[PDB]
Amino acid sequence: NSCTHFPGNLPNMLRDLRDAFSRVKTFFQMKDQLDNLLLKESLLEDFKGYLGCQALSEMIQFYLEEVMPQAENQDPDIKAHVNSLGENLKTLRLRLRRCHRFLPCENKSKAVEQVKNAFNKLQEKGIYKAMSEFDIFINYIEAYMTMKIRN
Amino acid sequence: NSCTHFPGNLPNMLRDLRDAFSRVKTFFQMKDQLDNLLLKESLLEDFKGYLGCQALSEMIQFYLEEVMPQAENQDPDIKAHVNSLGENLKTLRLRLRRCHRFLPCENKSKAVEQVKNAFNKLQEKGIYKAMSEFDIFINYIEAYMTMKIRN
């Protein structure tokens, strides 16, 4: 129900991110007095190839935890607008993550989480069984590898 | 040069992991007195689909940091054999990571690392430029999204 209106609302969400940026753009454009470009175009190339998800994901995390927390304190009157731009961004991130695998690098295997929960419950007996089944773990790794080096 | 003999040596590496397991198998099979299976086959299904890399990666990390460190202390005479099985495993992991994208979920975008290094160097001016270019960051996110919802 987080995925109703999806993906038709993706363009609207970008439109709202861009309107949220507009209320902080002039403050930052005035304060930046350099003409060099920090987000080079090669960042767009990485977004288009096999590592795109991982690159966007790390850039979203870089702005939420490294740029925005320091920018918000640049001035009392822009703190809520910077904080609001971070919320449109977390909102977009969450929609891509949860709906139809648009940010797959951020998904987790539920099979892995079920093995980990069963192991934790067995406690010490969980160590002895995790090790006695290591040959089955090797069977699975061979399966992932043969899938790529053969056919 | 870590990738010479690759991928032809992948099968040998599995052969050595299996020989490394053999020297700890009987100790663990004796200690596990349960007949249930912990590594269910659904873990193999996740290894074959879109989330395979992430599932194997998390399972490799689960054995190196959660199972092996506790198993090694089960008995003085098996500590070096368990520790040796963990080294064949880290070795295999590293070869897949570094050679020809066999564990891509563990790779990092070098474009991202270059933006982060430039930002760090500019220090405070790095915050003002990261924010004045946020519209360019939105242009790149739109590019990743249109690539998937169109064509």
Curated annotation (Swiss-Prot), chains A, B:
It is found in: Secreted. Keywords: Cytokine, Disulfide bond, Glycoprotein, Secreted, Signal. Disulfide bonds join 3-99, 53-105. It comes from the Eukaryota. GO terms for molecular function: cytokine activity; growth factor activity; interleukin-10 receptor binding; protein dimerization activity. Its main location: secreted. One of its GO terms (biological process) is response to activity. Produced by a variety of cell lines, including T-cells, macrophages, mast cells and other cell types. Glycans are attached at residue 107. GO terms for cellular component: extracellular region; extracellular space. Belongs to the IL-10 family. Major immune regulatory cytokine that acts on many cells of the immune system where it has profound anti-inflammatory functions, limiting excessive tissue disruption caused by inflammation. Mechanistically, IL10 binds to its heterotetrameric receptor comprising IL10RA and IL10RB leading to JAK1 and STAT2-mediated phosphorylation of STAT3. In turn, STAT3 translocates to the nucleus where it drives expression of anti-inflammatory mediators. Homodimer. Interacts with IL10RA and IL10RB. This is Interleukin-10. It comes from Homo sapiens (Human). The gene is IL10. The chain holds residues 28 to 178 of 178 of the full protein.
